[PDB]
Amino acid sequence: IGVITKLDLMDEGTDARDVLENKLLPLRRGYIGVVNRSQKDIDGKKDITA
Amino acid sequence: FVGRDFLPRGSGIVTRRPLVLQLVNATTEYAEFLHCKGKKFTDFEEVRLE
């Protein structure tokens, strides 16, 4: 399972649409995009619901 | 570092190959190529595009 994380930290002018839609890199099951927690969120202790 | 914008970059792989820059001290500031012998460029944008 290939996962591309922290999708809120991308370069200005860019998008991961063709990467996550299994178009830039051909994969059998494609990718699943999540956003993990940065160091600020690590310090803030973000829970499951939020 | 040069001071003028004439070298590409971008999303995905764009900055791929450096330039063969042979700087020669002369009076007139211009540019010439191996594959464009007979033609002289004065703009680095023209250099970048070709």
UniProtKB/Swiss-Prot annotation, chain B:
Which superkingdom heads the taxonomic lineage of this protein's source? Eukaryota
Domain comment, in the record's words? The dynamin-type G mediates homodimerization and plays a role in self-assembly.
Q: Which family does it belong to?
A: Belongs to the TRAFAC class dynamin-like GTPase superfamily. Dynamin/Fzo/YdjA family.
PTM comment text: Phosphorylated by CDK5 leading to synaptic vesicle endocytosis (SVE) activation.
This chain's source organism reads: Homo sapiens
Spans annotated as G2 motif: 14-16
Its function?
Catalyzes the hydrolysis of GTP and utilizes this energy to mediate vesicle scission and participates in many forms of endocytosis, such as clathrin-mediated endocytosis or synaptic vesicle endocytosis as well as rapid endocytosis (RE). Associates to the membrane, through lipid binding, and self-assembles into rings and stacks of interconnected rings through oligomerization to form a helical polymer around the vesicle membrane leading to constriction of invaginated coated pits around their necks.
Q: Cellular location of this protein?
A: Cell membrane; Membrane, Clathrin-coated pit; Cytoplasmic vesicle; Presynapse
Official protein name in the record: Dynamin-1
Entire protein: which part is shown? 51 to 100 of 864
**Related disease?**
Developmental and epileptic encephalopathy 31A: An autosomal dominant epileptic encephalopathy, a heterogeneous group of severe early-onset epilepsies characterized by refractory seizures, neurodevelopmental impairment, and poor prognosis. Development is normal prior to seizure onset, after which cognitive and motor delays become apparent.
What residues bind GDP, as annotated?
Answer: R9, G10
Assembly: Homodimer; homodimerization is mediated by the dynamin-type G domain which promotes assembly-stimulated GTPase activity. Homo-tetramer formed from two dimers in the absence of lipid. Oligomerizes into a helical polymer that self-assembles around the vesicle membrane, when associated to the menbrane through lipid binding.
Phosphotyrosine: which positions carry it?
Y30
